[PDB]
């Protein structure tokens, strides 16, 4: 589970499940699930990506990020992104 520092202009908003775009070993953009899917009303636990990774706007958000950087699902925590 590689871990990356989240960049200063990435959209950090505390802990939470998110997509991250990784460039030069840094998360240059994060998009939290709770923002991508305004219907995720949960509590940001790691195993919830096994369910939520399939939602269409998550795939759509990831595909856009992939146009410029390696993208993965994971967890934002303490200014780090952890790939899940």
């Amino acid at each position: 589970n590689k871990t990356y520092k989240i960049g200063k202009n990435a959209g950090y908003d505390g802990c939470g499940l998110c997509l991250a775009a990784i460039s030069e070993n840094e998360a240059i953009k994060v998009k939290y699930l709770r923002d991508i899917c305004p219907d995720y009303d949960g509590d940001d636990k790691a195993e919830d990506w096994l369910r939520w990774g399939t939602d269409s706007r998550v795939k759509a958000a990831a595909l856009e990020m992939e146009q410029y950087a390696y993208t993965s699902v994971g967890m934002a925590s303490c200014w780090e992104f952890v790939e899940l």
Binding site: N1, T3, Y12, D13, G14, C15, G16, R34, P38, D41, G42, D43, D44, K45, A46, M75, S77, C78, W79, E80, V82
Partner: protein, 153 residues
């Protein structure tokens, strides 16, 4: 396949959780009548942690202005113990902190950040803040943990 008792508890739990969700949302709206949109779980939890922490940033002790609770970048819910080192995504690990203070702490634990190994004054004051919060004892314990096994990560 389900017992009678299980059927009745499922119904009562679903209704009680609907009431609890409904009262929490109305309470939030009472304090933030001008909140634009529908308050989400993160917003409700910010208010709950604000109350459990007596209105103070857990890392700095600075007073959080309740009027600014939902301001962009002002305060955040984050993990006390970094997920990358603990896999801990639990409620017991969640704290309400000023964004600037959270950025300063970064991927350190509170024990590291406040120099708990020297039993420093800052560590004693942080522990005192945690102990006087309205956190359950297991949540207080989690935030103050000193020993970690990071080999599974």
């Amino acid at each position: 396949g389900k017992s009678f008792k299980d059927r009745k508890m499922i119904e009562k739990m679903q209704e009680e959780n609907r009431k609890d969700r409904e009262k929490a949302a109305a309470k939030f709206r009472e304090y933030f009548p001008n909140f634009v949109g529908e308050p989400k779980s993160k917003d409700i939890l910010k208010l709950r942690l604000y109350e459990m922490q007596h209105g103070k940033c857990l890392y700095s002790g600075k007073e959080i202005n309740l009027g600014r609770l939902n301001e962009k970048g002002y305060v955040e819910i984050d993990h006390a113990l970094p997920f990358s080192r603990t896999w801990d995504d639990s409620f017991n690990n969640k704290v309400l902190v000023l964004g600037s203070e959270n950025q300063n702490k970064g991927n350190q634990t509170p024990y590291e950040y406040f120099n708990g190994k020297d039993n420093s004054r800052e560590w004693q004051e942080f522990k005192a803040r945690v102990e006087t919060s309205r956190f359950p004892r297991s949540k207080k314990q989690r935030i103050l943990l000193q020993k970690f096994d990071e080999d599974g990560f």
